[PDB]
Amino acid sequence: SGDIAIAGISGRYPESDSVGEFRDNLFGKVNMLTCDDRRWKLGHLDLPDVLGKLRSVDRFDSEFFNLNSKQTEMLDPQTRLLLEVCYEAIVDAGESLASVKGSRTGMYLAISSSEPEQAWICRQDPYIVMGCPHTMSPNRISFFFDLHGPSIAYDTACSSVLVALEAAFQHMRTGVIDSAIVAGVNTCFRALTSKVYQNMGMLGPEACKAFDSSGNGYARSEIVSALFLKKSSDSKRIYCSVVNVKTNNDGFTPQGLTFPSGEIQEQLMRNVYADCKLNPKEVSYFECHGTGTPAGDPQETNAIYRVMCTPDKREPLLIGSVKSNMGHAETGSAMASITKVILAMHEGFIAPNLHFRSPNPKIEGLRDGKMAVVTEATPWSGGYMAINSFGMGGSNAHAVLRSYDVSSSKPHPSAHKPRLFTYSARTEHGLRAILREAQTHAASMEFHALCQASADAPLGSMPYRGATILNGQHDFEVVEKCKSKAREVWFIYAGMGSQWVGMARCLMQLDVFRHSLEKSAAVLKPHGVDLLNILSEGTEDTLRTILNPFVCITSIQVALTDLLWSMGIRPDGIVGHSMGEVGCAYCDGCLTAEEAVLTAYWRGKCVTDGKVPPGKMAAVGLTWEEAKSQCPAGVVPACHNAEDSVTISGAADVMLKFMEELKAKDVFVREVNSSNIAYHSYFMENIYASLKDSLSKVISPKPRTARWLPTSVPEELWDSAPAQSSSAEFHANNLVSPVLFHEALQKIPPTAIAIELAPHGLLQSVIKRTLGNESVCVGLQKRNYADNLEFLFASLGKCFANGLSLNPLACYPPVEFPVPKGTPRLSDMVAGAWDHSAQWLVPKNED
Amino acid sequence: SGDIAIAGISGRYPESDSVGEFRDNLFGKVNMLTCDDRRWKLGHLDLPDVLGKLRSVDRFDSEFFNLNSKQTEMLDPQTRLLLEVCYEAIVDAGESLASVKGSRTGMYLAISSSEPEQAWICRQDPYIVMGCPHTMSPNRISFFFDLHGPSIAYDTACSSVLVALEAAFQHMRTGVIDSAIVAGVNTCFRALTSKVYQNMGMLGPEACKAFDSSGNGYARSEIVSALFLKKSSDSKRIYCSVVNVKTNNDGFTPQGLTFPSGEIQEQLMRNVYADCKLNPKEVSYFECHGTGTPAGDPQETNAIYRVMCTPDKREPLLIGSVKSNMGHAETGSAMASITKVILAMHEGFIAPNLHFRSPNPKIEGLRDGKMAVVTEATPWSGGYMAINSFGMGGSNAHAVLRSYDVSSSKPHPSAHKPRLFTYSARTEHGLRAILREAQTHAASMEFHALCQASADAPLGSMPYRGATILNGQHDFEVVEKCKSKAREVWFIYAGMGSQWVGMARCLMQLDVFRHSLEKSAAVLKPHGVDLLNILSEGTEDTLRTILNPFVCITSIQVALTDLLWSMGIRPDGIVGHSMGEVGCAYCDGCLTAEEAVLTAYWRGKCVTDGKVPPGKMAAVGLTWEEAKSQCPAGVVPACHNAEDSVTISGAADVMLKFMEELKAKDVFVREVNSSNIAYHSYFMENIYASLKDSLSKVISPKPRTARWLPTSVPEELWDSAPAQSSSAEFHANNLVSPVLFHEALQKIPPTAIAIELAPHGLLQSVIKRTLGNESVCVGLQKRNYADNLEFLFASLGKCFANGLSLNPLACYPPVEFPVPKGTPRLSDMVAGAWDHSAQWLVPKNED
Incomplete structure (x- = not known):
């Protein structure tokens, strides 16, 4: 089976409208949990004040997705945001709407919240049937992108993303599909949903205090995030390979259904490593489930200790949990874990945990030093990372990822040459941001090649078009609003x-132009x-x-x-x-x-060779009929250039005299450099026979x-x-x-x-x-x-902004795919470029 | 890969509390759609009067499932019924709670209704968190039965059961699991859910008129049904083999998201047959999706026609849809399709469609005679059947099943011999029904062997125990309520x-008893x-x-x-x-x-050889101390049998005289046949040395x-x-x-x-x-x-009813597994045997 890559990523996270902002919050040690009235009033139902919240859930570019206002109003906000995030993840992979269309791409969605249907069913609106059932979220994505793979909603609670990843991984390995979208979503619209979790004793008052002795429950959080998976052979980008994924269930536990079984978690992990023939000691970092619960954290970490911390492992296993940074996004939670792992593999640094002060004394591997919690940004040199995700009903999942460590040994020959960058967007502001981001990455030919490969959008879908010149001496930007009708x-x-x-001299820098002149020479x-x-x-x-x-x-x-x-x-x-x-x-x-x-x-x-008599040519400010009527014997109208501009041609002496007569009448006269030949006149009749015979050969x-x-x-x-x-x-x-x-x-x-x-x-x-x-x-x-x-590039950029389609990179040597490690993300610039001018219906909290 | 069998089945269907009642309704041409106030008042919201409804949704044997009343009240009625149906399907496979415990069994559930959570969330009851989320339904099953395979909820709307079957099939083929439960559920508690489907134009006023020209939408219906899957090598029963299952999505359709693509359905079917190397012409019956919609029925059937009706196929393809009989149970719908296919494979007859009068003129294969709708009970000789299930969001699935046609060539040697049948149940009434069902099947040793193999339940789980004698000359039934404490x-x-x-003479009919006597001889x-x-x-x-x-x-x-x-x-x-x-x-x-x-x-x-003097023995109505004090010289108390019963022993002349003296005192005297020997007396002292020396060798x-x-x-x-x-x-x-x-x-x-x-x-x-x-x-x-x-059997049956554990079949030659085709179902008798004395909370319709 071909190697399976994560080729693209995007998402919305608490206080983070992109993977880039989520990265900055993680490394900046920003607590993404907030205490504000965005969902319901503070102190409502005596709930925890802390909630991880998306910045916006009421904005969506419905016109890009061909959705009318009635369909959009009754579409789950999770599905609205997921449509944008799926497009961003496709673009981040260097793919386009045209490249995914009609493909064997599967859609695998972790979703469990029915809060939109619960809030809106009383309206009796038929658009609820297409907008709110869990199946309609993945099916809407498969419909819009024209994807023919499986299109499935999964619920295993907190493990659902890794269960969806296992299904996608199996379908890719067995050849059912060639690519996949794996996604996870969660939103917190109803305070009653938080209230039943609080009444179960599941919620902590402050944060997910992962691995800490003060761990007392989790903080609820929101997420919308997606991965684009492809075979490594067919990928333009590779963040990492998926090595293996498995799922099991705890079965019967004498402590009750919601009590985690560290013994069955151990059995799952052992099976993952045995099946792929990987030694568990090769994992240098482990992204735990790590909810900050008094029972869960010791059960998980001691199972990890028994599997991963072999007697011959010299270096401590680094452990972390992204839930300490952003809370627990429940059904979508492993998307944040995967995003943090991809960021560590891309940046070469593991983002630190928050809220870790005193290790839980029941965690054996922290007490003996075989495990260490990442509390500062920690360098990571590649290899293997592992991820746990455990559902509250005993549905466990474990994944192993491998870094992509291929670096370019030489800069691309055109990395520092002037290059025309062309792009299209939904808004003028978004396009001007993309053109600035392209300038920030002007030295990356690989970034430019991914942008160019993803830029193939129908003329009506992206109404703003623009260009800039990378590595130029002069600032050049053009941005225009195009009509959807093609121009000739x-x-x-x-x-x-x-x-x-x-x-x-100047254009000989371009190989195509130089080789054409070398052939002519x-x-x-x-x-x-x-x-x-x-x-x-x-x-x-x-x-x-x-x-x-x-x-x-x-x-x-x-x-x-x-x-x-x-x-x-x-x-x-x-x-x-x-x-x-x-x-x-x-x-x-x-x-x-x-x-x-x-x-x-x-x-x-x-x-x-014809030794033509001395002639002249001049452009004159006459109409064609004025030139015919005013030309003296031996001068003729030779070129009709414009309504008020004719080039006359004739004998040099007669031309000079007539040019002075025209100037004396305030008629515009400009001599044309014709090397003293009267072209396009009876002087050329003597050349016709010789030229025709030469050209016939x-x-x-x-x-x-x-x-x-x-x-x-x-x-x-x-x-x-x-x-x-x-x-x-x-x-x-x-x-x-x-x-x-x-x-x-x-x-x-x-x-x-x-x-x-x-x-x-x-x-x-x-x-x-x-x-x-x-x-x-x-x-x-x-x-x-x-x-x-x-x-040349400014002229072509002006043409592109006005509706011309072109590939400006084709004048330079191609970039080889997949692009090297550390090539900048594309999802971040797309996430900022949507038309969010319209406000859409969102589920209101219960009164 | 080993062959994958459907080994057991159970379910609740509209007007059908078992697979047996569903069978009788199908072959009896009973319309299982009803017009009554069970869910909401007739004429509420101007809804269709017709709804397929389960007979009971408020009954559940919570004590058997170790669920307290608070957990049971907030458990989804779909999950309550599914727990019973899963136990019935396990028993129907000839498996038990003990045989599935700790197994690599996966749980794959098609579920989409959130109506219980929507109705109950306002209570703020923490038990909702364990009772109503979709994940908690499969996870509760994995918890109760102690199953360690994957435990997953699936939603692809109407195709979800075949998508769950594909996942189970892949996990069995890849060796992730050894067995699986595949299930589907649907309930209709809220009239508003029907109202949004009516407002979408999806609902017909009368029935699913599959393939008929009058087809005008579907009728909503309920279901709770489950399959037990095992490898054919490890199965005690085989209904059929799963040959192949696949899923895809329609992608973009210019008619809209809910319009079915017959071209993508054709592509899916072609891939299923190509992948398993089966010629499509070998399928003799096709269970269609067949919702009775003007757009869906022609798209599906013409795709089937292009794939299955090859030019060299001489016999018409038989087609049907179970939705004509019971309506459309949405997310659970393919469980009814699979049940009808299993019934046809088991009974040798295909159940007929209802409501077919005039073929839809757009169905090409009905117009040219290459296809025929089953409108009467039609004989079927084995081979392959196919099933379609298509989700409203374009998620398609297709399955191919093969009949199990192994028949026993000779009746089992004990088929007509007297046999002790022993069983346990939740109720006295249920147990007496099971014992009568066993009498109805008295000639089936294979049925008795499946019952005996499934009967292994903990003494506390099934409080009623009983027995009957199959093929006896006399009616024997014993039923007792056991205490959970074992008896010595x-x-x-x-x-x-x-x-x-x-x-x-009589017990020499038993091989074990005869062989023991032959060894002694x-x-x-x-x-x-x-x-x-x-x-x-x-x-x-x-x-x-x-x-x-x-x-x-x-x-x-x-x-x-x-x-x-x-x-x-x-x-x-x-x-x-x-x-x-x-x-x-x-x-x-x-x-x-x-x-x-x-x-x-x-x-x-x-x-x-010792030539002992003439002696006698007699049982006398004396105490031990009265016998010691009253015995004359030469008579001794020999056996203390009871407080008021001693056997005396002595010289024959002295014994006869003392026996007459005791009778003359109204003391009970009965001579014991001792062959004129005074055993257990001083007469045996002369034998002691010779006997000790003989026995020492x-x-x-x-x-x-x-x-x-x-x-x-x-x-x-x-x-x-x-x-x-x-x-x-x-x-x-x-x-x-x-x-x-x-x-x-x-x-x-x-x-x-x-x-x-x-x-x-x-x-x-x-x-x-x-x-x-x-x-x-x-x-x-x-x-x-x-x-x-x-x-012997009446004595042992009385012991079993009072708490003795035994296998009464072990005295006869064993049954070879898997059992032959046509062995009676076990699920039907279990479905009738629950403790349904308690009434539980059900979601009420919206006021």
Whole structure:
């Protein structure tokens, strides 16, 4: 049988809304028992003033769980909190709603309180039938998460969690299930329930004084906590392995049904160690049942002494009870014991007991020094821990856990590199807390990998989306409220004028981007072009050639496309400007990377060899029809960029004169660096035949998809045979024909996410103006920006916050699972991120 | 893994106080749903008038379960009834309180109703903590029966019994336990619980119309029922084997949490058959969940159709639902399904559904004839049956059972012989019913063997004891109320005058008695004595010899001692009269059977060879001191029989004259047949030396125990060296010395059970007069009685009724376990035999 791991944990404990706060209370020696009126008035029925209480039981994110207000009002508060805690434990394991859906996951719940049904049955509300019976708690979890394993409620009183763990452990060992949720709950809504326990003489007035001579009963407490169990081979996280679990019953005791039998407890423990072939002496710490009762504490500890404290054991057995810290959460109590054991295995320190001053003189192992109570935070070096949990009806259970001590020998190569962190949450406040927690753990690539693996939630489930940059030089945070409707993603490939000195240097830090450029360089090397030297060591004079801008722009557009694809980003639509249609053809799958780079090369080579007369190009503040009517002979409208922006092209002398005439009319004029070539004009007709013949030896024609809108062909010709195929003829015609860019941009939805793939996002202002205010427009690089890796991540983070799905870690080497010991918890950040704006019905105390 | 059997069953069902009454209601087509005010007033809250109700929920034998009145008043009525039902199921398996005590037996309970706690918590009674929480029901059973296996409460709503059965099955297969109790309970005390189910649209107005087109919801019902599970190798009874059990959950259903998924039900069934490698077509009957719901019935039956109705299956799959007969007992419901399946396997007939008139047209297998609803009692030839049970929260379970079809090929050799049946009960009425049930089953040796194996109860637990003779010629019944204090058992060995013609003929039918006489005959054969011929063909003249009476009486006393020992009867005290001290010496372990028979032989041989002068003996109505003072010279008091009865011994002529002188004084005189020998007188002094020398070659001296009171030695000499040993000297002195029988009888407690071991109980009147009215005095044979086997059994039955422990079957060949198919149930007779004189608190309906 595969090894069985506890892979995730979460919970609510007294004065503790997470495992993290429970940890801080345990190590801080905070008494989690409180004396306040949260459940009933102080002094009611002459009850003990002390009660372990959850901070909130009336808050629940009902919309996330698809529960209407009527169902939520009649749902047991234990089940409301357990739904959240189960999601937190799944996320803490590095799992998601998508990864557990339809799985062979069992649900095993320790539950015994019927107080909600007792309080609400008089309402005659049919929703009580789905909200209050014990079975409906585990079944609601299996329903919401789509779990097909067993879904069972257990009651053995105080041992119920370890009995549920035994059932889950057996089902995993026998192959009935592949994973399990094991959980335990308890709440104290009715003072009458405490009164009958007080009248039985079970309640102490102050605390569970475990192992102390003053032990005089237990203090009642609340809990909602869950574990996610998986096979160690299939786990992303491992806190510990479950070695063995067993249960028995005391049978007949002459002292009465509620008197614990230390002899039957001894027999159970001996059977657990014999069955797994573990020597009991290998257990270095023991989390006792330890209720602080005059009869129970000696019976348990002397049974432990006879089994665990073998004559050859040199070191004392360390013992403790979490009930000294938080009280006794009855049916759920062993969840607190397991949580304390997991915290000790994760932190490397055992949390101390409270209220231990004078050892009970009937505890033999404290008197001879073979046992020691943990009263200070005590270092623990790994191995085995044991847990007892004993029901008041004689139902005993014993568990053995083993630490996971695998440490990473080397930091991950990207641990200290800039990384885009992306996450989603129920609230803006919760998301901003998660982004701060990610900054606190910026050096942990393993934490980031668990967060990324758990982040797969449906767009409607987590309405707030945001991002930050870990290990950046500049603070970056973006948080947006998304609509549940997906946005279209459009890739816009810029043309000439996007080139700049050093345009690739920064993004070459990313292996995907570097390897794409290395492939493009290998293709160009036989043609005498050193692409890598032009991109790394290139000067302004290197980029003044006709050829070099073409190969640089297309090679970067291919490498940017490969980078976006590696992160799972796919376009719904594609638009190119001029030579950008070569990048479009690569993105659409019409050209290979080799064909695309060679298409750019031959375009530049044929224009160079063709000895074209001196030309110029300029962007002018004219409409397309004004440009057609005002252009002098030898100048043409070459690019329709926007409604009020045309690029004109023509003979250098005629262009210079017309540019001065336009400036003299207060018309905006900006020369475009075209290396003295009049592109997209009759000057290129003499190049067409040579370029078409060169490209016919390189391009294998493939059909264009409906995603790519051509800008070299008018809309009325998009279904024409030349426009249906990325051919040598298509790419040669692109050089001669005008760029109908504004026509293509008008087809993009005003809500789209538009990503400009270029060495510099020169079209950003045009794209944003045409698509309007609801659009998201980003470039991936900016000319001479201080860090274009941060600029890329800020741009993609802004896209993610606005509804883009991506894996930002896919640009770095993967993390190996399971993650090493000490990787930070995820449950704590999720527990703080729910929509708790609504207040729900809670059982009121009996008047 | 060993095969897992259901070995015993009991239950309470609507209008059915036993499995037998439930069987009669099922086959009688009785609708167990009733319209009466037992729980709440008819028409209360506009509820359905129909409810399946237990006949009684306020009766419980609290004293048998060691529960005081305060504990019993606050104990859940489900748990009270379940304690009785668990004892009945243990007895039905041929097990006892002694056989389950300290065993690795698990307790697995399906329970969900908290109505008793809800009704009683306002009392603030501490006994609620031990009486009402779900865990305390299984834990109370494990406590009372001293069971050390797991003790767990399960809730998965309607599937909980099969989920509990899966857990028990896994624990038995993995060797966690050796046996299990699997049980299910449900009660309907609060009308508000029915009201919320009605408001959910779950309740039909009339019945569970399973598979019918008019199906419109279910009728609520009650149940308390339990199974005893054991390995088939270790079982005394087998109803069926558990082949496999599995559970899953529906997960997410787009129709909502309470909508059943026929696709996930199909997946569960396929996994059950694949895991045990059974072809689904081998199942000939299917006990469906079958609630009579418009959505549930088609989803279930069409899933069954796809799994079970393979293209190569020629015979239609028979289907049914016990919910059509008794309603839906919710959490306990599958106990009724299992009970109906066990009844079909035991009786060879499937009980019919009710309320089926028009098949639901959405049930595909009823439309094409691949499935058929059982609407009449249908013959079933063994093999496999399947059971579905589906929880309202999507928790599904499926079980496969296999019939036990082992039949006895030959009737047991003692099936039609007279047999003593002995039993104990809580009430006189219950015991007289059990004795009548035993008479109804008089031909079943297997039923008698199960009853005998389960009858081992502590003397204080079952205060009424009784017996009857099965297959006798005469009606015999004895019933007595025993005190919890044990009675001493005294064996009294008679002397001369107990012999009669044919004295062994009747008891030679018992193998133990015959084999003892055959051994004694083999010892005497070298001495020229044909003991068997004297005992079988002997005449009055054969018994007139001096020798033959001695060897006959002692051989019968040895054989009667061997017979009582075989039945487990041991004496606390032993007393002999004259030659009866040879039988005492055998019983006390001082003589072997060979030494005892040879001691009797040499006693008779030495008296024969000694040519003693003619003597007589007579019983006379004198005191011991009157006999000493009135005896003439040559007559002596020989035996002190009673205060007013002495046997005198002397010369024949002097005796005859003195007997006439006593008669002339109105003194009672009766001659004793001594074959003309004056035993226990100075006439025997001449035999002493010859007898002592003969016996010294036969007897190996052993110490007498304190149990044997000597009658040949005065009380003041009991600690003397001759009286401490059964020696040749002791047995030779017995012939000469007077018989101090009255002195020894005065040492017997007046409450003793005195058994006379002789060919004829001649001392019965003396023993009864001396011990007084509180004593029990019996003989084992009577001279010329019509049937001395019935006389023996009536005597032992009278001893048993007065507190003697014995196994009356040990005189016959043993029954081989497991018993064959069709052996009558034991649970039905126990269910009728409780002390239900007290009325206990029951939850009242909400006002």
